[PDB]
Write a protein that binds this ligand. Structure first.
Ligand SMILES: [Zn+2]
Ligand SMILES: [Zn+2]
Length: 230
């Protein structure tokens, strides 16, 4: 429903100022794996959440933005140091886009074979980003829910909308598994999922990296699945 195709990527308008971008990477025993991020227009600028898997795909996201919105991309925030979220950093930097990530993601990125963001976010004990480290983030509300899918995973709500982005932390309400748990925190995963729910209590549209947007049942289901990891 409403998928707009552009090159090898897919764009779906979720709200008046919000689109989901989807890119694909072929994987063994697995076929093509979708990864979602977001594109938000805030006034006269565009904000990006997560890159695509590759520089080439990320360049295509920028090309789509230029065609369909034609406003500068003021910044990107990337939600952890895995290829699906940070694989296209060089394309952002080539385009002159300021990039932000959890300080921990920047520390891990090089050894993960990834390029670090230019700026580091740090977080208060309540999980909310220290606002001075997230200048000009506009409607993006950045929240560290605690370790789960990775030690460094972060999440983003969008002010003025019913949308909250769970990244690779949250799976859909009928997901069979929690996906790749290779870098996960099995002890804190469930609490972290519920913390995300708590941080964005009014969000009715939960956007995620590896499934289509869903209701808050995605949060309760992910948390229930994570309970079993303890
Ligand atoms: Zn990941
Ligand atoms: Zn992922």
């Amino acid at each position: 429903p409403g998928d707009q195709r552009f090159g090898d990527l897919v764009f779906r308008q979720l709200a008046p100022n919000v689109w989901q971008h989807t890119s694909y990477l072929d994987m063994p025993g697995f076929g093509a794996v979708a990864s979602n991020g977001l594109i938000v227009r805030d006034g006269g600028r565009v904000l990006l959440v997560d890159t695509a898997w590759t520089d080439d795909q990320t360049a295509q996201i920028l090309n789509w933005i230029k065609q369909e919105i034609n406003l500068p991309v003021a910044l990107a925030v990337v939600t952890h140091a895995h290829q699906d979220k940070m694989g296209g950093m060089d394309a952002l930097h080539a385009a002159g886009i300021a990039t932000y990530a959890n300080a921990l993601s920047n520390q891990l990125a090089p050894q993960e074979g990834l390029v670090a963001a230019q700026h580091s976010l740090t977080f208060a004990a309540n999980g909310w980003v220290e606002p001075a480290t997230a200048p000009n983030f506009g409607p993006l509300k950045v929240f560290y829910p605690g370790p789960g899918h990775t030690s460094d995973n972060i999440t983003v709500g969008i002010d003025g909308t019913d949308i909250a982005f769970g990244g690779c932390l949250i799976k859909d309400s009928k997901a069979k598994s929690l996906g790749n748990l290779g870098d996960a925190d099995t002890e804190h995963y469930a609490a972290s999922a519920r913390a995300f729910g708590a941080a964005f209590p009014k969000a009715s549209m939960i956007v995620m990296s590896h499934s289509a947007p869903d209701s808050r049942a995605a949060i309760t289901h992910t948390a229930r699945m994570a309970d079993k990891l303890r």
